[PDB]
Amino acid sequence: MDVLYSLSKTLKDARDKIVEGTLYSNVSDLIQQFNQMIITMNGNEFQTGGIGNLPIRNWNFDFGLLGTTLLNLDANYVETARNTIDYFVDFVDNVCMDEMVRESQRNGIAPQSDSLRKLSGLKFKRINFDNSS
C-alpha cells in the first residue's frame, strides 16, 4: 500500500518539476529517487482487471534511465521522458481502479487485487517518499 502512494508523488513532483528549462540541481535529489524505481520494476508482469466491464490488460517493463549528463534540461530531454511517464500514468489508473472495487469481510482492510497483493511484497518497499498528502 504505502508503496502505491510514492508511485504518485513520484510522478506529480515529476510531471511538475521536470520541464524544458529548469537547472539540474532542483531535481538531483529527485532524479535519483525516480530511477531507483525503474530498476525494481523491469522484468515483473502485472494482472489488472477481470471483473464486470473492466478491461484486462498486461504490463511489461523494460525502460531506460536518465541523463544526469546535461546541465539545463533541453526540450529533447523532456519528450523522451514524458513518453515514459505516460505508460505509468495510464498504468496506475488501471491499478487504482482494480483495487477500488474488491471487498471482503474477514480481512476487509488489507489489499485484495492480484495487482496490489504483489506490491506489498518486500522487494518493492525501496520506493516510499514525501508522505505529506
Partner: protein, 781 residues
C-alpha cells in the same frame, strides 16, 4: 617484477585434451572350488567376482577417506571424450574376426572356453559374438563384458562426452559478435571443415565467487594482472612531431629570458618518445583491468594541469583514487581559474569530505565554464550488460566516444575565461600555456578518438566480467607524461593488430576456463567431503590447491583467513552435472563394493548361544549372517572416538548378547577342532585390558571336511555349532550370458585445440578508420 607476471600468464595452457584407453573396471572374475551342501568339492569349479586390489582399511573412518581418493583419481582420469577404433582387440573364436573391446574381455573368453563350464550356451554365445558398423550415421557397435557396476560407469561416459560439433559457422560465431560486425576489420579462412569435426566448449560462467566483496586483497592482484596483460597489447604509437622541434617552438610562443621564470617548469615534460606511449598504454589498461591510479605532479607546473583537464573530461573520475582527484581539482580551482578570472577574494578554503570539484559548480557563473563542471562532475561510467554474451562491460558515456563536442567545448570554455584578471603578470604565463592547448585542439580532438576506439575495441575480448572497485596497489601516473601526449600528436592513426587481439581473447579465455573448471573441481570435492562425515580432514587443504592451480598467487604468502571465508562461499554452490553425476554413482553402490572383497568384513555378533551356519556354495558352511536381525549394536568409529564408556567393558564382562559395526580384519581357520573348543569366545577378552580395539582379529571358519584334513566329524552326521558369526555379504556369482553388455560410440573423430588461427586477419589503411559513429577517426591534418 613486471615481465614476471606476464610469463606466468602467457604460459597458461589448461587446454589439455583428456582421453582414455582401458575400460575402467574394478572386478575381474576368478576361480574358486564349489562346495555343495554337505561340504564336498564337486569339481568343475564356478566363477565369482572379487576386486582387483582389496586395499580397504581398518576403521570406518580410514575407509571413507579411501573412497574419497577414488573420486580424485576418477576426475584426473575423467575421460573428456571417447573413441573405440582405438580400442580394437581380437576374438580367438566367433563367426569371424570378432574385433571386441579390451584385452580383459578377450582373456576371459579364451579362458572359460577351456575349463569345461556350463557347456554349449556359453561356447555358442562367445561364438556368434561380433562387431558391425552402421557407417551412415558414423555409429559403431562393439561387444564387451563387464559387470553391472562397470556397464554403469563406461555407459555415462558415452552419454556425456563433452565434445560438441564443429562447422564453419561455429568458428565464425566464436569471434565476438561486435568485431565481425566492426567494419574496419576483415576476416578470411583457408579451409572447409569436414562433417567429422568436434571442439570442447571452454565454459566461462561468471565470477561465481564475487571475489570483490571483502576480498579486496585479491582483486588488487587480479587488476594488476589483467592490467599488465593489457599493456602487452595497447598498440605502440606512431610518428609524432620530433621531440626537439615542438619543445623548441614551445620556448618561443611563451617568450622566456634571464632569472625571470614563469612557465619554465612546464617542460621536464618533453620525454614522450617514451611518455606518450606509456601514458597511452597505461590509460587503456587502467580502464580495461579497471585499475585505480595515483597522481604525481607539481604545483608550479601549471601546463601539466591544463592537460589534466584533458584527462578529467575523459575518465569518469571514479577511475582515480579519492585522495588524488581531491588534490588535482582544488589545485586547479585555486591556482588556475580564480587567479586570472578576477574571482580570487578567497583563494578557496577547503576541508576535505564532500566534492571539492563539484562545489565549484554551484559556485561562480559563466555558461561555457558552467557546462564543463556538470559534464565532468556528474560524468560516470555506463554500466552495460550483454555484448553478444554476458560481457558485463563498463563503457564510457556514448557522448565522449569521438562525438567529442566535449573537447571542443573544453576549449571554448578556455578561450573565454582568458578575459579578466588580478595579479598583473601571472596571466601572461598562464594563458600562454592555455593557448598551446587550443591550437593543438585540432589534434587533441584526435587523442580522444584514439582511446575512444582502442578501449572500446580491446574491450569485447574480455570475458572476465570486470566491475568498478577501488584497487589498492594503485599504478602511478605523472601529469608529466599526460601533458606530453597531449600537445604532442596528430595526423597519425594507429590500431590494434589482428594477431594481437586474438591472443588477448585466448588468454582471458583459458584463464576463465581454469577458474570455472577448478571451481567445479573444488565444489565437487567439498560436497563429497561432507556427505562423508570426515570431521577430520581439516579443510585448509582444498582451498590451498585451488588457488595454486591459478598461478600468480603466492599461496604460502596468504593467510588462513580469507581462505576459510572462501570455503564458506563455495559450500553454497552447485556441482557440474558431470562431476556430481559421478559421485552419486560411487555412493549408490559403495556398500556392495566394501561388503564383497576379502581382507575385511563389516562386524561380528556375540550370541552366547550355540547355532547353525549358512551353507553357501562359495565357502563350505561357515560363520555368517548378512542380516544381523535383532541384538543391539555399537559403532566402533563412534567408539575409539568417544573414549569407550565402559559400556562395552561391562557387557563383555557380564556376558550379554551383542554386536559390533565397521571396518574389520577377518581371520580364516580350518582344523574343525578350533570350533568345538569354541575358540572364538577368546579374542574378545583382550579389549578389557585395552579401552581401544584394533587388536581385535575376529574369527571365521571356512569349513568343508574336503579341504579341512579333519573330516573325522563331517563323518557321523552333523551341523556346525558356533557362537558368534560374521557380518559380510557374499561375492555374487557369475551369469556370463547376462553378465555381458553392448556398446556404442563413434568412428574416426577429429579433435581440435585453440581454433581461431584459421584466419588471415587483415586491416584497412589507417588513414581512414571508423568508430561507433561511422566517421573518419583522425581527419584534422
Amino acid at each position: 617484477p613486471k615481465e614476471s607476471i606476464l610469463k606466468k600468464l602467457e604460459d597458461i595452457k589448461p587446454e589439455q585434451a583428456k582421453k582414455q584407453t582401458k575400460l575402467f573396471r574394478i572386478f575381474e572374475p576368478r576361480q574358486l572350488p564349489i562346495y555343495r551342501a554337505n561340504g564336498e568339492k564337486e569339481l568343475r569349479n564356478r566363477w565369482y567376482w572379487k576386486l582387483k586390489k582389496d586395499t580397504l582399511p581398518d576403521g570406518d573412518y580410514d575407509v571413507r577417506e579411501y573412497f574419497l581418493n577414488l573420486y580424485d583419481q576418477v576426475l584426473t582420469e575423467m575421460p573428456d571424450y571417447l573413441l573405440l577404433k582405438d580400442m580394437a582387440v581380437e576374438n580367438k573364436n566367433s563367426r569371424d574376426a570378432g574385433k571386441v573391446v579390451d584385452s580383459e574381455t578377450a582373456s576371459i573368453c579364451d579362458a572359460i572356453f577351456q575349463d569345461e563350464e556350463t557347456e554349449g550356451a556359453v561356447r555358442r554365445f562367445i561364438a556368434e559374438m561380433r562387431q558391425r558398423v552402421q557407417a551412415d550415421r558414423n555409429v559403431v557397435n562393439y561387444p564387451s563384458i563387464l559387470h553391472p557396476i562397470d556397464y554403469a560407469f563406461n555407459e555415462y561416459f558415452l552419454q556425456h562426452q563433452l565434445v560438441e560439433p564443429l562447422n564453419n559457422d561455429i568458428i565464425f560465431n566464436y569471434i565476438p559478435e561486435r568485431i565481425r560486425n566492426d567494419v574496419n576489420y576483415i576476416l578470411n579462412m583457408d579451409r572447409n571443415l569436414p562433417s567429422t569435426a568436434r571442439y570442447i566448449r571452454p565454459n566461462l560462467l561468471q565470477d561465481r565467487l564475487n571475489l570483490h566483496d571483502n576480498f579486496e586483497s585479491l582483486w588488487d592482484t587480479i587488476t594488476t594482472s589483467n592490467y599488465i596483460l593489457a599493456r602487452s597489447v595497447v598498440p605502440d604509437l606512431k610518428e609524432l612531431v620530433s621531440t626537439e622541434a615542438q619543445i623548441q617552438k614551445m620556448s618561443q610562443d611563451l617568450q622566456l629570458e634571464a632569472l625571470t621564470i614563469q612557465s619554465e617548469t612546464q617542460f621536464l615534460t618533453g620525454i614522450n618518445s617514451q611518455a606518450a606511449n606509456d601514458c597511452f598504454k597505461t590509460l587503456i589498461a587502467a580502464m580495461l583491468s579497471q585499475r585505480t591510479m595515483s597522481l604525481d605532479f607539481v604545483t608550479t607546473n601549471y601546463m601539466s594541469l591544463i592537460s589534466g583537464m584533458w584527462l578529467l573530461t575523459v575518465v569518469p573520475n571514479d577511475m582515480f583514487i579519492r585522495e588524488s582527484l581531491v588534490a588535482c581539482q582544488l589545485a586547479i580551482v585555486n591556482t588556475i581559474i580564480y587567479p586570472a578570472f578576477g574571482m580570487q577574494r578567497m583563494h578557496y578554503r577547503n576541508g576535505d569530505p564532500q566534492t571539492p570539484f563539484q562545489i565549484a559548480e554551484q559556485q561562480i557563473q559563466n555558461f561555457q565554464v558552467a557546462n564543463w563542471l556538470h559534464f565532468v562532475n556528474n560524468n560516470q561510467f555506463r554500466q552495460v550488460v550483454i555484448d553478444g554474451v554476458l560481457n558485463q562491460v563498463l563503457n564510457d558515456n556514448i557522448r565522449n566516444g569521438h562525438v567529442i563536442n566535449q573537447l571542443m567545448e573544453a576549449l571554448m570554455q578556455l578561450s573565454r575565461q582568458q578575459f579578466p584578471t588580478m595579479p598583473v603578470d601571472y596571466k601572461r604565463s598562464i594563458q600562454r600555456g592555455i593557448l598551446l592547448l587550443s591550437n593543438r585542439l585540432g589534434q587533441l580532438v584526435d587523442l580522444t578518438r584514439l582511446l575512444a576506439y582502442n578501449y572500446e575495441t580491446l574491450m569485447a575480448c574480455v570475458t572476465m566480467n570486470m566491475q568498478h572497485v577501488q584497487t589498492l596497489t594503485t599504478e602511478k601516473l605523472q601529469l608529466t607524461s599526460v601533458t606530453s601526449l597531449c600537445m604532442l600528436i596528430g595526423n597519425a592513426t594507429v590500431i590494434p593488430s589482428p594477431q594481437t587481439l586474438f591472443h588477448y581473447y585466448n588468454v582471458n579465455v583459458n584463464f576463465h576456463s581454469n577458474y570455472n573448471e577448478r571451481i567445479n573441481d573444488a565444489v565437487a570435492i567439498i560436497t563429497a567431503a561432507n556427505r562423508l562425515n570426515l570431521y577430520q580432514k581439516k579443510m585448509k587443504a582444498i582451498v590451498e590447491d585451488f588457488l595454486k592451480r591459478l598461478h600468480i598467487f603466492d599461496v604460502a604468502r596468504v593467510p588462513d583467513d580469507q581462505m576459510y571465508r572462501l570455503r564458506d562461499r563455495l559450500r553454497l554452490l552447485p556441482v557440474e552435472v558431470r562431476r556430481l553425476d559421478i559421485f552419486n554413482l560411487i555412493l549408490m553402490n559403495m556398500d556392495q563394493i566394501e561388503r564383497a572383497s576379502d581382507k575385511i568384513a563389516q562386524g561380528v555378533i556375540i550370541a552366547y548361544r550355540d547355532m547353525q551356519l549358512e551353507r553357501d556354495e562359495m565357502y563350505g558352511y561357515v560363520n555368517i549372517a548378512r542380516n544381523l536381525d535383532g541384538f543391539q549394536q555399537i559403532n566402533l568409529e563412534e567408539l575409539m572416538r568417544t573414549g569407550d564408556y565402559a559400556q562395552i567393558t561391562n557387557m563383555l564382562l557380564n556376558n550379554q548378547p551383542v554386536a559390533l559395526v565397521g571396518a574389520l580384519p577377518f581371520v580364516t581357520d580350518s582344523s574343525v577342532i578350533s570350533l568345538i573348543a569354541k575358540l572364538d569366545a577368546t579374542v574378545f577378552a583382550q579389549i578389557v585390558k585395552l579401552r581401544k580395539v584394533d587388536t581385535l582379529k575376529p574369527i571365521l571358519y571356512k569349513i568343508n571336511s574336503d579341504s579341512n584334513d579333519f573330516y573325522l566329524v563331517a563323518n557321523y552326521d552333523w551341523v556346525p555349532t558356533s557362537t558368534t558369526k560374521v557380518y559380510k555379504q557374499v561375492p555374487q556369482q557369475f551369469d556370463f550370458r547376462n553378465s555381458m553388455h553392448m556398446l556404442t560410440s563413434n568412428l574416426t573423430f577429429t579433435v581440435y585445440s585453440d581454433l581461431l588461427a584459421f584466419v588471415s586477419a587483415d586491416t584497412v589503411e589507417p588513414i581512414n578508420a571508423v568508430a561507433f559513429d561511422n566517421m573518419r577517426i583522425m581527419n584534422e591534418l
